[PDB]
Amino acid sequence: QCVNLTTRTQLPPAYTNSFTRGVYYPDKVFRSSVLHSTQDLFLPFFSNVTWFHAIHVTKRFDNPVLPFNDGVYFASTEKSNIIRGWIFGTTLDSKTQSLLIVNNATNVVIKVCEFQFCNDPFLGVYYHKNNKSWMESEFRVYSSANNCTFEYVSQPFLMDLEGKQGNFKNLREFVFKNIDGYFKIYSKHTPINLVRDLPQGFSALEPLVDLPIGINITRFQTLLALHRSYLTPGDSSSGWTAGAAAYYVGYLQPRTFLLKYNENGTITDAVDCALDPLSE
């Protein structure tokens, strides 16, 4: 296929537990001071998820292809915006319409096209020593793009492209759902402050976009970025620095909750209707 990266000591995955995550509103209507029960694609309380590491500062770079099931909950713990974008598709061999959602430092590019992806897709920036500037140099995503159905180009902006090290200080929350082909993305940012694992807490979720595709998505993959600097030996085939970040992926399954609404009509407390007979 294409070129790949070497000296990749892939650790075995570890299974951890999440604590009351994935509680979003039923529909487009507000209700107040009233208890109402629905059936949507949720995470059950106290479930087991899979933890994938991306810390190198060691020698860990793993980004496998995950199959797209009936709702994927995505919480991301970042400190320097390591996770750039996502790709969606079935086979990724320029014969199936592929969705590519990338958050570049200049534009937000969303393209539903027929792309050709390689074996190991990633991103790469270069940091100079004589000048303090972050420029995108290595862009090893695709070879060619011929056919397209959709293109979404946003406004130009500026990002710092941080590459510092330390503890996690962002919590990015993405909720991917499909009802009748409508791709429903839900966004939430939380300024967390802890070292590792997953923090505990309770919060509601806000909408982002409802992009109306009509394709069948089977698999997806999350692309990372590499820092090329003075710590590299001097080659792009073996010298890399992924950074230090962690992302949590959980698959949604249709539960039933009871939601408590205050005077402002937001989610305050959720009761799982089948976890134990007291909550039942």
């Binding site: 487009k28 507000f30 009509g214 402002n264």
Partner: protein
């Protein structure tokens, strides 16, 4: 009361007949708040179009279509829509709007139809048999016909087979008909497919070049994003009118609210799981719905043999001898300061009787 009881002698008591409802007066319809417009200014009016064998395909997506912006800056000659009425292009939405722009002669316009024969419809641009779209043709003797002579427009004369619908064929090779293969000698059985037209300003109106743009779309297929125009109304409040808010049909009094919502969802329901409030989708204002269908009517009689006059009890009505009780609004009976024994029960400690020149007192 007689047609309620189905009798001719009505005994003393309170009876129920019907209900007082208030009819709506106006009907306001919202929806357009999005200022996006499809680029019609280059489709029907360009600097130079293309030939019939090499027509230009333009994709129209992520905008709002309109019909009234077509007859204010351009005059046409031929306008025919196949498979759809031209007056149904406003309420109905569209999917996959494609425009095929090509320039032909004035005698070839009738050959561009879904189900004709000839040369152009079989060798240049094949139309489908179940075609659903509009065909727009107009005269343009301004840019397509040079005063010194324009011969840049070409058409295909010789081809091996026919064409599929929505197929473009561009070839500049020498056509071969029989034996002695040519590869360019310009001899016997060596045909050139791309032949020149005869667009001259010295001829008649039939030899003038005509610009034909065919709009093709789909109906009731795929998640659409480009719909047609929509008429909008004004906003009226504190009146029981009919309305339509984001597809929800409601009729009632839209009073001002004292609560605020969150800026991503639209409607509002109360403790009873029914609609109590709605956000205005144009002015972003929370409006409380309350319909004007409240109350019933009740008839008080002293008896048929006693008198032929009544008192009328309006149940949930705020208010000759109009008196408001705690049980409702009473018309046809006067309130007295004296307290008698109760004869006909009404509600909330009010009773009516027939005392003293005599009337019904409450």
């Amino acid at each position: 009361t007689k047609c309620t009881l189905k009798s001719f002698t009505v005994e003393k008591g309170i009876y129920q007949t019907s209900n007082f409802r208030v009819q709506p007066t106006e009907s306001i319809v919202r929806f357009p708040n999005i200022t996006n417009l499809c680029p019609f200014g280059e489709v029907f009016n360009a600097t130079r179009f293309a030939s019939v064998y090499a027509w230009n395909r333009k994709r129209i997506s992520n905008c709002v279509a309109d019909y009234s912006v077509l007859y204010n800056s351009a005059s046409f000659s031929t306008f025919k829509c196949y498979g759809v009425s031209p007056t149904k292009l406003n309420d109905l939405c569209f999917t996959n709007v494609y425009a095929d722009s090509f320039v032909i002669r004035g005698d070839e316009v009738r050959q561009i139809a879904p189900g004709q024969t000839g040369k152009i419809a079989d060798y240049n641009y094949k139309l489908p048999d179940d075609f659903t779209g509009c065909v727009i043709a107009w005269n343009s003797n301004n840019l397509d016909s040079k005063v010194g002579g324009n011969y840049n427009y070409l058409y295909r004369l010789f081809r091996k087979s026919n064409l599929k619908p929505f197929e473009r064929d561009i070839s500049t090779e020498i056509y071969q008909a029989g034996s002695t293969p040519c590869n360019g000698v310009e001899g016997f059985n060596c045909y050139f497919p791309l032949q020149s037209y005869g667009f001259q300003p010295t001829n008649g109106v039939g030899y003038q070049p005509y610009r034909v743009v065919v709009l093709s779309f789909e109906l009731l297929h795929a998640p659409a994003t480009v719909c047609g125009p929509k008429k909008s109304t004004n906003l009226v409040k504190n009146k029981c009118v009919n309305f339509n808010f984001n597809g929800l049909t409601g009729t009632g009094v839209l009073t001002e609210s004292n609560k605020k919502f969150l800026p991503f969802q639209q409607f509002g329901r109360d403790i009873a799981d029914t609609t109590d409030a709605v956000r205005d989708p144009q002015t972003l204002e929370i409006l409380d719905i309350t319909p004007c269908s409240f109350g019933g009517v009740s008839v008080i009689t002293p008896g048929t043999n006693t008198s032929n006059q009544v008192a009328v009890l309006y149940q949930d009505v705020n208010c000759s001898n109009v008196f408001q009780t705690r049980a409702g609004c009473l018309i046809g009976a006067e309130h007295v300061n004296n307290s008698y024994e109760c004869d006909i029960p009404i509600g909330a400690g009010i009773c009516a009787s027939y005392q003293t020149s005599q009337s019904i007192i409450a």
